[PDB]
Amino acid sequence: EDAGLVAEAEAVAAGWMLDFLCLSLCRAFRDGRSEDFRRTRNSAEAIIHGLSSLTACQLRTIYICQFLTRIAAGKTQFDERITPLESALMIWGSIEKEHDKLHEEIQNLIKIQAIAVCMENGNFKEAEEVFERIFPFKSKLLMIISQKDTFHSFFQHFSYNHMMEKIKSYVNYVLSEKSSTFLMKAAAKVVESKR
Amino acid sequence: EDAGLVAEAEAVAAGWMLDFLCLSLCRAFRDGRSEDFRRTRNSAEAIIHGLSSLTACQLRTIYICQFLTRIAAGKTQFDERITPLESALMIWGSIEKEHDKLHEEIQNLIKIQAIAVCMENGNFKEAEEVFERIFPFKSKLLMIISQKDTFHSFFQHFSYNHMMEKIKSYVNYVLSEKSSTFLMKAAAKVVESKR
Numbered sequence: 237e238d239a240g241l242v243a244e245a246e247a248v249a250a251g252w253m254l255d256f257l258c259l260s261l262c263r264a265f266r267d268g269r270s271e272d273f274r275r276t277r278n279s280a281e282a283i284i285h286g287l288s289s290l291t292a293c294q295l296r297t298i299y300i301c302q303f304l305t306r307i308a309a310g311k312t313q314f315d316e317r318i319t320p321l322e323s324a325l326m327i328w329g330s331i332e333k334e335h336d337k338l339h340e341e342i343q344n345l346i347k348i349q350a351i352a353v354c355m356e357n358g359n360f361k362e363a364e365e366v367f368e369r370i371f372p373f374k375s376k377l378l379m380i381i382s383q384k385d386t387f388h389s390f391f392q393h394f395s396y397n398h399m400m401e402k403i404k405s406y407v408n409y410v411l412s413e414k415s416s417t418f419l420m421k422a423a424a425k426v427v428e429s430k431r
Numbered sequence: 432e433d434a435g436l437v438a439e440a441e442a443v444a445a446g447w448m449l450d451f452l453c454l455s456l457c458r459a460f461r462d463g464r465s466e467d468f469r470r471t472r473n474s475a476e477a478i479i480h481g482l483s484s485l486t487a488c489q490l491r492t493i494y495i496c497q498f499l500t501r502i503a504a505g506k507t508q509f510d511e512r513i514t515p516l517e518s519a520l521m522i523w524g525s526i527e528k529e530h531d532k533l534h535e536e537i538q539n540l541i542k543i544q545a546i547a548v549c550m551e552n553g554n555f556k557e558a559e560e561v562f563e564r565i566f567p568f569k570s571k572l573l574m575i576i577s578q579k580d581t582f583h584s585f586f587q588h589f590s591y592n593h594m595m596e597k598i599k600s601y602v603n604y605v606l607s608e609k610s611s612t613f614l615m616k617a618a619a620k621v622v623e624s625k626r
């Protein structure tokens with residue numbers, strides 16, 4: 237038995253498990269299956285520790301998982317001194333991906349929702365701190381926060397539901413790109429055989 | 432897309448991941464790769480949460496993982512009010528497996544080592560508490576503990592190294608039984624293709 241070839245087979249299998257768990261995390265996010273998302277996220281986190289070197293595609297995969305993790309924790313010790321949605325904005329702006337119309341829409345929706353979720357939770361001091369970290373339009377947005385005007389028409393256009401719908405659209409592309417991964421494809425074949 | 436068939440494919444893949452991680456946990460235990468064992472154990476724990484119903488063979492797999500986890504923590508919040516080696520003894524005596532000569536050897540070696548590791552660590556009050564929970568031979572073993580006679584010939588026959596050698600022998604059988612699991616076999620094929 238060669239220790240080096242065994243380690244290589246374990247690295248190949250870790251790569252396969254990573255893709256499968258990203259696919260599962262995406263479907264759970266899309267479906268709103270919170271507990272399933274939590275478990276899959278925990279598994280992806282554990283599996284990602286088994287890898288010490290990542291390819292360009294594997295880095296894209298783990299960063300999509302981290303982005304979705306922060307988006308799901310948006311309204312929830314987290315060392316970072318910023319909110320989950322601000323942390324999602326940093327991951328989003330650094331992922332190796334096209335900066336198309338959809339990228340800017342999600343970016344601006346997360347920017348507004350990082351402030352709005354603090355107002356929804358009644359923490360208006362925090363909402364101002366988030367605004368200062370991210371940002372004529374600024375003066376109007378600052379006036380809104382100051383007057384606890386949570387349901388202003390601006391917030392109804394840049395809503396939480398709109399942020400989630402735009403991100404779910406991106407998830408569907410990722411779900412389609414990885415729908416052909418080895419582990420999921422093999423498992424599906426076994427299920428159809430039964431059946 | 433049928434939610435039920437996707438959930439089924441995820442259950443098939445969880446089963447495959449469980450077998451692969453047990454195989455990896457066994458090799459890490461056999462090789463003495465502590466940090467690798469810790470990571471694999473963490474991954475098996477996370478993955479096992481993705482399963483809510485287990486077959487007879489899957490139950491055997493997770494219990495072997497739990498047994499090896501307690502053996503590896505033998506000399507280390509753990510709610511249980513017993514030591515890791517006493518907890519390994521409970522898992523060992525309840526696993527669905529043959530009670531052959533090797534089973535009794537490992538059982539008796541763990542029984543003696545649950546006491547001896549407390550003496551090695553200088554906690555002789557705990558060594559007596561372990562002895563009382565597990566157990567003419569008893570009176571002689573109690574006299575040994577009472578006199579802090581850690582290096583008595585009895586302990587050199589029922590040593591830690593002997594306990595580990597007997598368990599590693601069992602691990603090799605499990606490693607051979609699961610060496611043909613789908614995930615590991617597929618990964619090995621890919622590695623050979625490269626080579």
Ligand SMILES: C[C@H](CS(N)(=O)=O)c1ccccc1
Nearest residue numbers: 280281284298302303305306
């Ligand atoms: C705790 C995880 C680690 S991992 N390896 O990406 O699973 C995480 C890190 C950074 C942002 C979100 C989430």
Ligand SMILES: C[C@H](CS(N)(=O)=O)c1ccccc1
Nearest residue numbers: 475476479493497498500501
């Ligand atoms: C924490 C793990 C849980 S699991 N699901 O078996 O990984 C464990 C439980 C019992 C004994 C040893 C270890």
